[PDB]
């Protein structure tokens, strides 16, 4: 979204965009190439946009578009949760065997060059513990919500 304003031709011997004592002109956009090919900057000029943004409209649009009350202690119970506990471990086994491969390799093939010529978003740390995080977050939030429902409901 952008806003504009038509400039005169009477100031052809003077500075079009007659701007002055401020340093917030170089912000918000440099004049883009797809827009200065047209009447920028000799027919019209750009003008800055910020938003009259306030509380009681910010919070009612935050809290009402993304909210879940009774969902916060549901279970998604175990037939697909414990199934997903198989779904990650299996390739994590094979990716651990791939983690075995690079570490027992450990050759002086100029190892700062050996690490940089095989960046692949791959085994040793990238395709590692990322899975360990997902196994951790899924099982704790499952089991902690399970113990609370025993506590709360009788």
């Amino acid at each position: 979204i952008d806003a504009f304003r038509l400039i005169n031709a009477n100031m052809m011997v003077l500075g079009h965009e007659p701007r002055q004592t401020t340093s917030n002109l170089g912000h918000l956009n440099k004049p883009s190439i797809q827009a200065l090919i047209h009447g920028l900057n000799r027919h019209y000029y750009s003008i800055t946009i910020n938003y009259r943004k306030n509380e009681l409209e910010q919070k009612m649009l935050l809290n009402l578009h993304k909210k879940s009350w009774m969902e916060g202690l549901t279970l998604q119970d175990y037939s697909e949760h414990c199934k997903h506990n198989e779904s990650v471990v299996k390739e994590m086994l094979e990716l651990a065997k791939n983690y075995n491969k690079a570490v027992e390799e450990e050759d002086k093939m100029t190892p700062e060059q050996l690490a940089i010529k095989n960046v692949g978003k791959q085994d040793p740390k990238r395709h590692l513990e990322e899975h360990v995080d997902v196994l951790m977050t899924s099982n704790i939030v499952q089991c902690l919500a399970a113990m609370l429902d025993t506590v709360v409901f009788k």
Partner: protein, 286 residues
């Protein structure tokens, strides 16, 4: 027969500003306007609205003013600029609702047969309440009871289409309740998911305090509809016992040996890779 209503977030939004329009002369504490809609199925859709002049008197609470002629012409405008949209009902605020709403609804059911009303809550916006919507049916009341109106409820939600999430996501920009949550995000969902559990319960606390204490006349419908709740909660038993530790342990095993060990060895790999690269730059400075 309405499944649920879908609140497009321009309508509420276009109520709050109109409450703020009259707020410079604000002495009415209610704003009534017209709710445009788009009826598709048993699920309802709302995406546009406007307001209408309305007044109400605290004395006798039955002298009230919807403006028909203003409702005719301005809806004729919004029909002309967009023939997709039509009326579906009306709105107001002030959650302690005036009992005049029988008269407001039964007037403008001659515009839409299955008319519907949505209460927004401009100032109470804190714990668990986005909006609320009612539906109008009229039985007598029950089998051996006198006549009544009895507004009934249809559940509500806040909807989302494309090119308003574009307007949403560009306007949050601060915390946003970021995408799929971390450990801290899920625990807070368990916290304020449970902070509303007793909040609904403190309301049903006070109801059977003030009805059983002896003030207001008892409903009979809500009593036994509350009764089956207490005869439906689970208890602890041996079958709950041996099963819970059968699958808590099974959830536990995945955490224990597969996540704690492997994360340690990766950090143990960062030991040797640091200490080799530390001292081999140290001993080769000079």
């Amino acid at each position: 027969a309405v499944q649920k209503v879908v609140v497009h977030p321009l309508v509420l939004l276009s109520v709050v500003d109109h409450f703020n329009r009259i707020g410079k002369v604000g002495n009415q504490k209610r704003v009534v306007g017209v709710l445009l809609g788009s009826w598709q199925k048993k699920v309802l859709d709302v995406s546009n609205s406007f307001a209408v002049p309305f007044d109400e008197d605290d004395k006798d609470d039955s002298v009230w003013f919807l403006d028909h002629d203003y409702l005719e012409n301005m809806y004729g405008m919004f029909k002309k600029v967009n023939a997709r949209e039509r009326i579906v009902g009306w709105y107001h605020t002030g959650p302690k609702l005036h009992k005049n709403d029988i008269a407001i609804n039964e007037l403008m059911k001659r515009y839409c047969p299955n008319s519907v009303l949505v209460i927004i809550d401009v100032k109470p916006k804190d714990l668990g309440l986005p909006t609320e919507a009612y539906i109008s049916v009229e039985e007598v009341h029950d089998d051996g009871t006198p006549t009544s109106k009895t507004f009934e409820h249809v559940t509500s939600e806040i909807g989302a289409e494309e090119a308003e999430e574009v307007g949403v996501e560009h306007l949050l920009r601060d915390i946003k309740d970021t995408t799929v949550g971390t450990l801290s995000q899920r625990i807070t969902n368990q916290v304020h998911g449970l902070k509303g559990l007793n909040s609904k319960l403190l309301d049903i606390r006070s109801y059977l305090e003030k009805v059983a204490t002896g003030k207001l006349p008892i409903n009979h419908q809500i009593i036994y509809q509350l009764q089956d709740v207490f005869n439906l909660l689970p208890d602890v038993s041996l079958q709950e016992f041996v099963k819970a530790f059968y699958l808590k342990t099974n959830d536990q095993m995945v955490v224990v040996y597969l996540a704690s060990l492997i994360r340690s060895v990766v950090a143990l790999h960062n030991l040797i890779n640091n200490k080799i690269a530390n001292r081999d730059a140290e001993k080769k400075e000079g």
